[PDB]
Write a protein that binds this ligand. Structure first.
Ligand SMILES: [Zn+2]
Ligand SMILES: [Zn+2]
Lengths: 433, 180
């Protein structure tokens, strides 16, 4: 796929989000489509409605509140019309721009839709495994626990090109920690690094031939150090749209090309941003746009506000079934941004409709690991800080799966399968790098 | 090519030693820089750019443009409305002003982006530099209009002397042009 932006196609995708949630709501709550009607017009009767949270003016103030939101309907639902929301009868809520929501309410007089109740979107199902599969996974590990290390760029500071800290880290994982898998998120060479941005790039006396491009700078600076990661540790690279080495600077972002990075096949895999995969039974959902920094909630209610922001935001992501549900995506003001390629938001949805067991969405906020709705949510933090001080990384240690220990749940059915209960078996440490 | 680049914007380079900023128009006259026989040279402090010092900036500008493009600003046709917004109606072309009949269009069209990249490409195109077919960086009334004009034969010679630099600068644009 090329750099094309097509308005009809983008709008198709936004329409389809509303329609697919309309079907999820109808199946979960067992409602008939005749119970759904157009909230943008007057009725005498209470109706159910599904739509997208949008601002009530298209040229809107940076700071929204519960009196300045509208609901956008699908093309079939309300000819795409948008209607102002009256949220005065609802004491507890958290909304954000781009959120798909379901309401019970009424447009009494034509110009407002009064929300009487919020129908919460249901959490997606968790993946399951057969007893045979779990036994193989048990044999893979030879008793011992599964170890996965996760890092996120930047890897060098703002005022130099030192990877000394990364070398120290590599020595540690090779010779002490010895994990099974290492997941490394970009940026590797961040195009917005201030020396890169300004072109203040020095002569490197430790290179025989100077790089002429940022791609060559990666081959001379990162490749030789990455090559020293033990071949026994499988290493996964996931890019950022700020990666100078990527030529696909929109989310969702195609994977890097490993051969081009001159990294060895023996232990390096390049994955897309986002990507979903299993390590043994554990489903990972990885995405490298900063949802946790960017999602700006409009909030009412003491109970909602007393909760932790990171819990609320993780639940919004699980409910929305996409790793960056904010739309329009955030902008850094022009320098950088989410850079959403709206036509392909499809690929940023939860693969198979499954919630991940572990969800990793690096952020510039402080590192954190939290269980929310039985999903382990991890922000490993930046590997190095801009000043050159130690950053952090995440270590995930998961007890080896055991059908006999009880910690796996048998799901009832003719075909016997088990919920991984990764949250019950996983320990996440956030370690100074 | 003339009309194609009429609305593109200049590639602005910053000098690694002294930080003076200037538009780069190819192997053409300028009061700020000189393409000498050993490379691109800053006229304020005489320091030579290395290739990485040039190409990192080319790439940075490209990516700034590509990021602006993905911000997805839209604009309305109707001269009596004109709103710019990033909101997209589920009917994409439809304007979000109550009752406005204008058509919405991406404000950074993909034609404009492609033209912007083709302009950058032209700057490092040897054949175009030699034939003197690049777009001028300065209008005649600009206070920075160049004081000395380069000769054709200087441009030919200087272009062949800097072929390698040009081609490497050009490859950085092509990284994104084949991807478009
Ligand atoms: Zn200078
Ligand atoms: Zn309009």
């Amino acid at each position: 796929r090329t750099m094309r932006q097509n308005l009809q196609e983008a709008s198709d995708v936004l329409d389809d989000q509303i329609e697919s949630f309309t079907k999820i709501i109808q199946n979960h709550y067992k409602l008939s489509p005749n119970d759904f009607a157009d909230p943008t017009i007057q009725s005498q009767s209470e109706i159910y409605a599904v739509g997208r949270i949008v601002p009530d003016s298209p040229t809107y103030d940076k700071f929204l509140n519960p009196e300045s939101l509208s609901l956008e309907t699908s093309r079939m639902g309300g000819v795409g019309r948008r209607v102002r929301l009256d949220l005065s009868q609802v004491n507890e809520l958290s909304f954000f721009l781009g959120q798909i929501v379901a309401f019970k309410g009424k447009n009494a007089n034509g110009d407002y839709f009064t929300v009487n109740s919020i129908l919460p979107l249901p959490y997606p199902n968790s993946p399951v495994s057969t007893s045979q599969e779990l036994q193989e996974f048990q044999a893979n590990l030879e008793g011992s626990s599964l170890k996965v290390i996760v890092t996120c760029g930047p890897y060098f500071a703002n005022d130099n090109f030192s990877l000394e800290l990364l070398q120290e880290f590599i020595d540690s994982i090779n010779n002490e920690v010895k994990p099974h898998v290492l997941i490394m998120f970009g940026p590797f060479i961040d195009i917005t690094h201030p020396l890169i941005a300004s072109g203040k790039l020095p002569n490197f006396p430790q290179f025989k031939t100077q790089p002429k491009t940022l791609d060559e700078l990666f081959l001379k600076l990162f490749t030789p150090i990455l090559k020293t990661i033990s071949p026994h540790i499988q290493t996964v690279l996931i890019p950022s749209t700020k990666d100078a080495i990527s030529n696909h600077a929109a989310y969702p972002q195609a994977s890097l090309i490993r051969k081009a990075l001159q990294l060895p096949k023996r232990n390096f895999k390049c994955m897309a941003n986002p990507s979903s995969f299993q390590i043994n039974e554990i489903y990972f959902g990885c995405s490298n746009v900063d949802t946790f920094k960017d999602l700006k909630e409009v909030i009412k209610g003491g109970t909602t506000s007393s909760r932790y922001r990171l819990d609320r935001v993780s639940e919004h992501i699980l409910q929305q079934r996409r790793y960056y549900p904010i739309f329009p995506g955030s902008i850094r003001t022009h320098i950088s941004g989410a850079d959403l390629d709206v036509s392909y938001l499809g690929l940023t949805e939860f693969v198979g409709g499954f919630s991940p067991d572990i969800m990793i969405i690096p952020s510039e906020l402080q590192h954190f690991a939290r269980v929310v709705q039985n999903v382990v949510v991890i922000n490993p933090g930046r590997f190095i800080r801009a000043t050159g001080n130690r950053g952090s990384y995440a270590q995930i240690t998961v007890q080896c799966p055991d059908l006999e220990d009880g910690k796996l749940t048998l799901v009832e059915g003719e075909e016997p399968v088990y919920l991984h209960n990764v949250w019950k078996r996983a320990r996440v440490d956030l370690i100074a790098s | 090519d003339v009309e194609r680049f009429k609305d593109t914007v200049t590639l602005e380079l910053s000098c690694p030693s002294c930080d003076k900023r200037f538009p780069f128009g190819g192997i053409v006259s300028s009061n700020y820089y000189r393409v000498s026989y050993n490379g691109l040279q800053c006229k304020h402090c005489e320091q030579l750019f290395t290739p990485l010092q040039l190409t990192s900036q080319i790439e940075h500008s490209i990516r700034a443009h590509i990021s602006l493009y993905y911000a997805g600003w839209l604009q309305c046709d109707d001269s009596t409305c004109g709103i710019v917004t990033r909101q997209v109606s589920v009917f994409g072309k439809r304007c979000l002003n109550d009752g406005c009949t204008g058509v919405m269009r991406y404000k950074y069209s993909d034609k404009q982006l492609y033209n912007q990249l083709l302009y950058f490409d032209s700057l490092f195109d040897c054949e175009k530099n030699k034939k003197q077919e690049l777009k001028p960086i300065y209008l005649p009334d600009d206070l920075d209009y160049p004081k000395e004009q380069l000769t054709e034969s200087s441009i030919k010679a200087l272009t062949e002397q800097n072929r390698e630099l040009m081609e490497t600068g050009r490859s950085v644009v092509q990284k994104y042009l084949n991807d478009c």
